Design a protein around this motif. Structure first.
Motif, PDB file in Angstrom:
ATOM      1  N   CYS E 168       0.814  -1.205   0.000  1.00  0.00           N
ATOM      2  CA  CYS E 168       0.000   0.000   0.000  1.00  0.00           C
ATOM      3  C   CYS E 168       0.855   1.265   0.000  1.00  0.00           C
ATOM      4  O   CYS E 168       0.324   2.363  -0.162  1.00  0.00           O
ATOM      5  N   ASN E 169       2.159   1.133   0.236  1.00  0.00           N
ATOM      6  CA  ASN E 169       3.099   2.245   0.202  1.00  0.00           C
ATOM      7  C   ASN E 169       3.977   2.297  -1.044  1.00  0.00           C
ATOM      8  O   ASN E 169       4.761   3.237  -1.182  1.00  0.00           O
ATOM      9  N   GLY E 170       3.891   1.320  -1.940  1.00  0.00           N
ATOM     10  CA  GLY E 170       4.741   1.315  -3.113  1.00  0.00           C
ATOM     11  C   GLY E 170       6.041   0.555  -2.999  1.00  0.00           C
ATOM     12  O   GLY E 170       6.954   0.809  -3.786  1.00  0.00           O
ATOM     13  N   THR E 171       6.156  -0.371  -2.052  1.00  0.00           N
ATOM     14  CA  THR E 171       7.327  -1.225  -1.908  1.00  0.00           C
ATOM     15  C   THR E 171       6.861  -2.670  -1.867  1.00  0.00           C
ATOM     16  O   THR E 171       5.825  -2.964  -1.280  1.00  0.00           O
ATOM     17  N   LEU E 172       7.632  -3.573  -2.465  1.00  0.00           N
ATOM     18  CA  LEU E 172       7.168  -4.943  -2.652  1.00  0.00           C
ATOM     19  C   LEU E 172       6.906  -5.662  -1.341  1.00  0.00           C
ATOM     20  O   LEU E 172       7.735  -5.651  -0.431  1.00  0.00           O
ATOM     21  N   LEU E 173       5.743  -6.299  -1.262  1.00  0.00           N
ATOM     22  CA  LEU E 173       5.557  -7.400  -0.336  1.00  0.00           C
ATOM     23  C   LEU E 173       6.586  -8.474  -0.655  1.00  0.00           C
ATOM     24  O   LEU E 173       7.026  -8.619  -1.796  1.00  0.00           O
ATOM     25  N   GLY E 174       6.988  -9.218   0.350  1.00  0.00           N
ATOM     26  CA  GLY E 174       8.092 -10.124   0.211  1.00  0.00           C
ATOM     27  C   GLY E 174       9.407  -9.541   0.662  1.00  0.00           C
ATOM     28  O   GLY E 174      10.304 -10.294   1.038  1.00  0.00           O
ATOM     29  N   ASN E 175       9.529  -8.220   0.650  1.00  0.00           N
ATOM     30  CA  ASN E 175      10.547  -7.515   1.409  1.00  0.00           C
ATOM     31  C   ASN E 175      10.032  -7.056   2.758  1.00  0.00           C
ATOM     32  O   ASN E 175      10.792  -6.475   3.531  1.00  0.00           O
ATOM     33  N   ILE E 176       8.756  -7.306   3.053  1.00  0.00           N
ATOM     34  CA  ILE E 176       8.158  -6.908   4.320  1.00  0.00           C
ATOM     35  C   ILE E 176       8.778  -7.644   5.493  1.00  0.00           C
ATOM     36  O   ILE E 176       8.515  -7.304   6.648  1.00  0.00           O
ATOM     37  N   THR E 177       9.612  -8.643   5.219  1.00  0.00           N
ATOM     38  CA  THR E 177      10.300  -9.390   6.253  1.00  0.00           C
ATOM     39  C   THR E 177      11.408  -8.590   6.918  1.00  0.00           C
ATOM     40  O   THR E 177      11.980  -9.057   7.904  1.00  0.00           O
ATOM     41  N   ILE E 178      11.720  -7.400   6.409  1.00  0.00           N
ATOM     42  CA  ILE E 178      12.686  -6.536   7.064  1.00  0.00           C
ATOM     43  C   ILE E 178      12.107  -5.935   8.339  1.00  0.00           C
ATOM     44  O   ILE E 178      12.860  -5.504   9.218  1.00  0.00           O
ATOM     45  N   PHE E 179      10.782  -5.902   8.465  1.00  0.00           N
ATOM     46  CA  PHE E 179      10.077  -5.490   9.665  1.00  0.00           C
ATOM     47  C   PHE E 179       9.829  -6.678  10.578  1.00  0.00           C
ATOM     48  O   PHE E 179       9.906  -7.828  10.149  1.00  0.00           O
ATOM     49  N   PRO E 180       9.551  -6.440  11.855  1.00  0.00           N
ATOM     50  CA  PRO E 180       9.165  -7.545  12.737  1.00  0.00           C
ATOM     51  C   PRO E 180       7.942  -8.265  12.194  1.00  0.00           C
ATOM     52  O   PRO E 180       6.906  -7.653  11.931  1.00  0.00           O
ATOM     53  N   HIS E 181       8.055  -9.577  12.053  1.00  0.00           N
ATOM     54  CA  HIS E 181       7.012 -10.322  11.375  1.00  0.00           C
ATOM     55  C   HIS E 181       7.057 -11.764  11.834  1.00  0.00           C
ATOM     56  O   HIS E 181       8.066 -12.240  12.351  1.00  0.00           O
ATOM     57  N   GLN E 182       5.940 -12.448  11.632  1.00  0.00           N
ATOM     58  CA  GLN E 182       5.900 -13.897  11.610  1.00  0.00           C
ATOM     59  C   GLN E 182       4.903 -14.331  10.555  1.00  0.00           C
ATOM     60  O   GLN E 182       4.036 -13.566  10.136  1.00  0.00           O
ATOM     61  N   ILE E 183       5.051 -15.567  10.118  1.00  0.00           N
ATOM     62  CA  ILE E 183       4.118 -16.189   9.193  1.00  0.00           C
ATOM     63  C   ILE E 183       3.266 -17.166   9.982  1.00  0.00           C
ATOM     64  O   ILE E 183       3.781 -17.908  10.819  1.00  0.00           O
ATOM     65  N   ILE E 184       1.963 -17.142   9.745  1.00  0.00           N
ATOM     66  CA  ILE E 184       1.080 -18.185  10.241  1.00  0.00           C
ATOM     67  C   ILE E 184       0.819 -19.118   9.074  1.00  0.00           C
ATOM     68  O   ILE E 184       0.099 -18.771   8.135  1.00  0.00           O
ATOM     69  N   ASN E 185       1.423 -20.295   9.138  1.00  0.00           N
ATOM     70  CA  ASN E 185       1.205 -21.365   8.184  1.00  0.00           C
ATOM     71  C   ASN E 185       0.296 -22.369   8.867  1.00  0.00           C
ATOM     72  O   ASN E 185       0.656 -22.914   9.912  1.00  0.00           O
ATOM     73  N   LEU E 186      -0.887 -22.590   8.299  1.00  0.00           N
ATOM     74  CA  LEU E 186      -1.873 -23.430   8.965  1.00  0.00           C
ATOM     75  C   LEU E 186      -1.348 -24.836   9.203  1.00  0.00           C
ATOM     76  O   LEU E 186      -1.761 -25.500  10.159  1.00  0.00           O
ATOM     77  N   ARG E 187      -0.444 -25.303   8.345  1.00  0.00           N
ATOM     78  CA  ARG E 187       0.243 -26.567   8.564  1.00  0.00           C
ATOM     79  C   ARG E 187       1.019 -26.570   9.870  1.00  0.00           C
ATOM     80  O   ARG E 187       1.138 -27.611  10.522  1.00  0.00           O
ATOM     81  N   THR E 188       1.547 -25.417  10.271  1.00  0.00           N
ATOM     82  CA  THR E 188       2.532 -25.332  11.343  1.00  0.00           C
ATOM     83  C   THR E 188       1.925 -24.754  12.615  1.00  0.00           C
ATOM     84  O   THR E 188       1.756 -25.473  13.599  1.00  0.00           O
ATOM     85  N   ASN E 189       1.603 -23.468  12.626  1.00  0.00           N
ATOM     86  CA  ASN E 189       1.173 -22.770  13.824  1.00  0.00           C
ATOM     87  C   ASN E 189      -0.167 -22.102  13.582  1.00  0.00           C
ATOM     88  O   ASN E 189      -0.523 -21.781  12.450  1.00  0.00           O
ATOM     89  N   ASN E 190      -0.926 -21.930  14.657  1.00  0.00           N
ATOM     90  CA  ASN E 190      -2.176 -21.197  14.596  1.00  0.00           C
ATOM     91  C   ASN E 190      -2.085 -19.769  15.122  1.00  0.00           C
ATOM     92  O   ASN E 190      -3.107 -19.087  15.176  1.00  0.00           O
ATOM     93  N   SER E 191      -0.911 -19.293  15.523  1.00  0.00           N
ATOM     94  CA  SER E 191      -0.846 -17.964  16.107  1.00  0.00           C
ATOM     95  C   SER E 191       0.537 -17.360  15.914  1.00  0.00           C
ATOM     96  O   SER E 191       1.445 -17.984  15.361  1.00  0.00           O
ATOM     97  N   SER E 192       0.681 -16.130  16.401  1.00  0.00           N
ATOM     98  CA  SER E 192       1.891 -15.335  16.279  1.00  0.00           C
ATOM     99  C   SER E 192       1.955 -14.376  17.457  1.00  0.00           C
ATOM    100  O   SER E 192       0.923 -13.947  17.972  1.00  0.00           O
ATOM    101  N   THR E 193       3.168 -14.054  17.894  1.00  0.00           N
ATOM    102  CA  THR E 193       3.356 -13.058  18.938  1.00  0.00           C
ATOM    103  C   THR E 193       4.551 -12.186  18.588  1.00  0.00           C
ATOM    104  O   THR E 193       5.635 -12.698  18.304  1.00  0.00           O
ATOM    105  N   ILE E 194       4.345 -10.874  18.607  1.00  0.00           N
ATOM    106  CA  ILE E 194       5.393  -9.898  18.356  1.00  0.00           C
ATOM    107  C   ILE E 194       5.372  -8.899  19.501  1.00  0.00           C
ATOM    108  O   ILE E 194       4.336  -8.287  19.773  1.00  0.00           O
ATOM    109  N   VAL E 195       6.502  -8.738  20.171  1.00  0.00           N
ATOM    110  CA  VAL E 195       6.669  -7.711  21.190  1.00  0.00           C
ATOM    111  C   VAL E 195       7.480  -6.592  20.563  1.00  0.00           C
ATOM    112  O   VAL E 195       8.664  -6.762  20.272  1.00  0.00           O
ATOM    113  N   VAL E 196       6.838  -5.460  20.324  1.00  0.00           N
ATOM    114  CA  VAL E 196       7.480  -4.281  19.746  1.00  0.00           C
ATOM    115  C   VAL E 196       7.710  -3.255  20.848  1.00  0.00           C
ATOM    116  O   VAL E 196       6.786  -2.981  21.619  1.00  0.00           O
ATOM    117  N   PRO E 197       8.903  -2.692  20.970  1.00  0.00           N
ATOM    118  CA  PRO E 197       9.085  -1.552  21.871  1.00  0.00           C
ATOM    119  C   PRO E 197       8.443  -0.295  21.319  1.00  0.00           C
ATOM    120  O   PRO E 197       7.749  -0.343  20.302  1.00  0.00           O
TER     121      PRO E 197
END
Lengths: 39, 255, 263, 235, 255, 39, 58, 59, 59
Positions: E168-197
């Motif tokens: 939505c800002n004009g930069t590719l998704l797939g580089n969004i991993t430079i920010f704090p992130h996790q992937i929810i893969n239904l095969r693997t995990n049902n949740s995610s936790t990010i602690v941001v200061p």
């Protein structure tokens, strides 16, 4: 400046490439040629 | 855990559903020592270029498939610089890391016997006294699909025996567990690993004329799809030579 | 300087804890090196990343702006928003604290005055404007022949860094003139130019070098050509003329290929 | 000779540069430097002196001394008496010693001192609310909304004056001298706490106001002050 | 183990299928120290009453849904006494514990990118130079359903960009991993936790005008039902302010 | 001048802003990224 | 930039055995990520082809 | 068809009777495959490079 | 009690004394609450903590 009845070798641009000619010469021998033998 | 990783130089196996590795006779492959040596010439050790995983063609495992065998060193004779060293030398030795791979699904049922037989001397497909031909016992990487016992199997050309119950040699399957083996039970594991040393009463012999080992995969229990439309599953075999030696450099024994 | 690590030797390994397995989901990059995967030799590796550090990477003095003297007068509001190539490099980061040295490359001749006009006051709008007579507005007099003028502006934040991106507004909810992004967040001043002669050409190029940089929050590099400055708008309207009105182009750098698996 | 180089900005004349120049008139002896009272080494010492805010600046009263004082009377309901929007560029502050030192600088930090003195007879009394609405807030227009910010309540008698400190409340580290909505400083407003009560019904009172900088006040980026303009040559 | 429990006062998350917690930039939220401070007034720390999990409305994740974003502190502006402290103060800071929750079944397939972007400055939905409106970048707890790229998206009213590929800002998704992130893969995990200061170049700023963070959930791979009649799954977001501060008490900035 | 088989770091304009690039580098670690985990 | 003198080689993906889903027509999706190892190094900073400006930004 | 959409990041795999080449990632930092990543778009500012690449496949 | 392929997340909230029964999950989450993921462990426990003006509560 970079480094040092005197002499002073001073590098103004602080790069090894930016220095002038390298006048400090040791390595040599003709024998790599003119005598390139086992014995 | 069930995780495993085996790195033989240039190549890496990663097995996430796994048993222990079978170390045949509790013996790792070694280089031929000086105490046991015969020939006087300094052998060559190719190491990382010959010693590495060579994956063969996959075989389709189906309802009614009787099994497969591969001969070693034979299966590797065209594979990389390991197979090149077989043709340019009189003699050679090696151990092998055999990694067998079959995965299906939790809805599939089946069992495979994966065994390594030293000196597996086949039987002629039937009748009179005929040596099985060199051509048939050296299929290469393709191995041999075991067909099955029949009165209608062609007896021409010195063909090997097709009956997996008798191990093609005339001894019962089910006693094949006396050899290094593992079972792939689709309920349990999707793979197998066997590390066999060099087995022979001779320090080195001709890689082309003599097949030291034989890898035999028998479908002990057939493949049931469960409720899925998948009636067949691939079986991939991957072999790493390990501590392979060659001596007696000559012209390639190839054509 | 920091050299990259040496490659250590590694042999065949049989291990029940694979280093090559993992989870992409955890949010962490791979720790895998070639010692985990293949069988390796010791390599003594003297290579450095020194040219990739943020000081060297952003420290080359790009062109920020161009102005033309119209009637021997020019004006430029200091910013990096106008030039796509330097704007993309600053926008690898959310926050930047830097001093900048400003070099003025002009093809004019004779005598020029640059006035740095600090924010909050009125600039000279023409040559001969009385505001070119200033007690406290810092100016530079130079003759373009024999040397290029250069001065350093320190870091003028109002904050501890510059915002490259700002997700806020300068006014409250109901205000209709709200401005979005970094434009309200700081203003670096403007440079006024005039010629005290006629002489040469009218072109004034402003080159700016960030120095003493501190960069903060890495961002995805800009994947699309810029459209407006102080925006992030990447939708480009090529023409106002006719039936192609209201057709927009993204203008990205992704290129296709005929087939996967055939490349 | 010694190799040298002339980097960009070497032959420059920068108006703000610091350099040594040859003395014309060499050997000249300056007249001796005696003691003079009043020496001032920093111009922020002028901003720290109280000076009257032209709180009454309006159409009729500008140009007269009456622009410095406001009238207070007795009222039944609390009213907002005065508003001092906090901008150093606003005429209220810009004309003072504080604000006219700060108009030479592009931005500032630190605390303001505003002192209100009531000029009335000795029998007059009052309570006033002096509120400071912090930045980002709306000018209150009610004493309930004004009291929710920084505020003092000054009783009136026997001491002339009272001082609200406008404390430094800012998101960023500096505030622009010229009003903008991003750095805007907030509002000081004057309210009746109870009432201004004179000794006689129609009686009235006058309120003055002064501003100075606190000791933590700081300025930076010296610029031209908008507080002087030259349209003509001086001959 | 995959079990996790996070207790922020008055409230407890319990995640039984879980990854590690992402600690953004290896930094826990702290209170603003005296070295870094600007304003002279003593701030308020609400602690347990403001710092606690606020679960937002769930979003239905479907075939063809392009994603969602929430702005912070914005999403919490109506939530408990944390949102009350936003309106009555000039300035505020906080860190956040974002817990994203999507569970389906072992028959479902799909992947979600859950990322936190500091200073996520949107792009106008297209065309001329228009600031995106305050109204659209402050949806509150509801967030914004990303719709998608179209020539037919309404360009009125300063609307934000709808294309998730460009973030939505004009930069590719797939580089969004430079920010704090996790992937929810239904095969693997049902949740995610990010602690941001608390991330900003300023010690505190206005909670209402400036959105520090943005929580963005992009369906990286679509949602496949497998064999089940469940074509949609909820996605619940739960935010805990942590070490939140407020200073400059005033009238509520509300209406 | 401002400050200091040798080297000399000399500031001609006596300001910290007027200096050239800052070449003295210590602070670093990729782990703020690539491994941004609690445990 | 790709040239035949310094060219780097190819990464390719193959089926070792098979991808087997629970149902016959079932399918799966593969993503891929790339990062540098710690020994990675670069030199000679230049302009990136990944940005182009055809218009003035006003 | 898939460029400009999120589906440009994933490939489909099915069950097949014979091994196929699923994907090819020719190793060039100037190729769109790598050039658009964080890795490749830092490396496109530099004329040449050394060192090892890490590629991670998730199904 | 479900089969092993069932899954769920539940909010268990405790509205403290003096409050209104929520009738919305936004209002319920503002009290003491837990969120229990469902799988591989059967049960979860909310503790209803002691919150009282007085020292005892009438049966």
């Amino acid at each position: 400046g970079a480094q040092v009845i005197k002499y002073f070798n001073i590098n103004y641009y602080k790069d090894s490439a930016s220095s002038g000619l390298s006048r400090q010469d040791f390595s040599q021998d003709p024998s790599k040629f003119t005598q390139p033998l086992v014995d | 855990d069930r995780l495993k990783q085996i790195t033989i130089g240039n190549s890496t196996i990663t097995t996430q559903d796994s048993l222990h590795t079978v170390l045949a006779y509790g013996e790792w492959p070694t280089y031929l020592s000086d105490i046991d040596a015969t020939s006087v010439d300094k052998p060559t050790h190719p190491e990382t270029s010959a010693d590495r995983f060579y994956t063969l063609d996959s075989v389709e495992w189906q309802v009614g498939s009787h099994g497969w065998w591969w001969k070693l060193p034979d299966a590797l004779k065209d594979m990389g610089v390991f197979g090149q060293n077989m043709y340019y030398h009189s003699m050679g030795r090696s151990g092998f890391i055999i990694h067998t791979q079959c995965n299906a699904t939790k809805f599939h049922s089946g069992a495979l016997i994966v065994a390594v037989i030293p000196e597996h001397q086949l039987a002629y497909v039937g009748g009179v006294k005929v040596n099985v031909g060199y051509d048939h016992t050296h299929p290469g990487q393709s191995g041999h699909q075991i067909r099955g016992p029949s009165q209608s199997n062609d007896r021409s050309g010195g063909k090997p025996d097709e009956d997996p119950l008798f191990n093609c040699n005339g001894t019962l399957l089910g006693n094949i567990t006396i050899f290094p083996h593992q079972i792939i039970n689709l309920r349990t594991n999707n793979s197998s690993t066997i590390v066999v040393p060099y087995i022979n009463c001779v320090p080195m012999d001709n890689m082309l004329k003599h097949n030291n080992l034989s890898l035999v995969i028998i479908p002990l229990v057939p493949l049931r799809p469960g409720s899925s439309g998948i009636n067949s599953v691939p079986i991939t075999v991957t072999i790493a030579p390990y501590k392979s030696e060659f001596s007696g450099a000559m012209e390639a024994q190839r054509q | 300087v920091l050299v990259v690590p040496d490659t250590k030797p590694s042999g065949p390994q049989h291990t029940t804890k694979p280093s090559i397995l993992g989870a992409m989901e955890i949010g962490a990059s791979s720790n895998a090196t070639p010692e985990s995967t293949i069988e390796t030799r010791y390599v003594y590796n003297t290579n450095t990343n020194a040219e990739a550090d943020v000081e060297m990477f952003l420290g080359r003095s790009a062109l920020w702006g161009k102005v033309t003297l119209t009637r021997q007068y020019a004006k430029w509001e200091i910013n990096f928003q106008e030039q796509a190539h330097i704007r993309k490099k600053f926008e690898f980061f959310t926050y930047l604290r830097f001093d900048m040295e400003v070099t003025i490359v002009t093809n004019n001749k004779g005598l020029m005055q640059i006035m740095f006009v600090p924010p909050g006051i009125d600039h000279p709008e023409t040559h001969d404007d009385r505001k070119w007579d200033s007690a406290s507005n810092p100016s530079v007099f130079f003759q373009p022949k024999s040397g290029f003028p250069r001065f350093t502006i320190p870091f003028t934040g109002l904050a501890s860094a510059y915002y490259m991106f700002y997700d806020g507004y300068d006014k409250p909810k109901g205000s209709d003139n709200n401005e979005y992004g970094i434009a309200p967040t700081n203003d670096m001043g403007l440079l006024c130019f005039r010629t005290l002669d006629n002489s040469g050409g009218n072109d004034v190029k402003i080159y700016v070098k960030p120095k003493h940089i501190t960069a903060w929050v890495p961002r995805p590099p800009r994947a699309t050509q810029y459209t407006h400055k102080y925006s992030t708008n990447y939708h480009y309207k090529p023409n106002s003329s006719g039936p192609d009105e209201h057709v927009l182009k993204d203008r990205h750098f992704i290129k296709t290929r005929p087939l996967i698996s055939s490349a | 000779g010694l190799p040298t180089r002339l980097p960009s900005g070497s032959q420059q004349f920068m108006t703000t540069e610091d350099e040594q120049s040859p003395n014309i008139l060499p050997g000249f002896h300056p007249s001796k430097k005696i003691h003079i009272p009043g020496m001032i080494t920093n111009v922020m010492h002028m901003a720290r002196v109280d000076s009257f805010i032209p709180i009454n600046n309006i159409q009729g009263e500008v140009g007269k001394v009456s622009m410095y004082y406001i009238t207070v009377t007795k009222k039944t309901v609390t009213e907002r008496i005065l508003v001092l929007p906090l901008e150093m560029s606003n005429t209220l502050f810009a004309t003072t010693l504080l604000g006219e030192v700060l108009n030479y600088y592009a931005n500032w930090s630190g605390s303001i001192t505003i002192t209100f003195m009531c000029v009335c007879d000795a029998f007059s009394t009052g309570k006033f609310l002096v509120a400071y609405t912090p930045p980002g807030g709306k000018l209150p227009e009610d004493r309930k909304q004004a009291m929710l910010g920084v505020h003092i309540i000054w009783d009136l008698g026997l001491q002339s004056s009272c001082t609200i400190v406008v404390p430094w409340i800012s998101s960023g580290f500096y505030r622009r001298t010229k009003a903008d909505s991003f750095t805007h400083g907030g509002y000081v407003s004057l309210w009746y706490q109870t009432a201004f009560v004179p000794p006689v019904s129609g009686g009235t009172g006058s309120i003055l106001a002064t501003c100075s900088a606190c000791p933590d006040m700081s300025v930076r980026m010296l610029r031209d002050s908008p507080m002087m303009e030259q349209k003509n040559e001086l001959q």
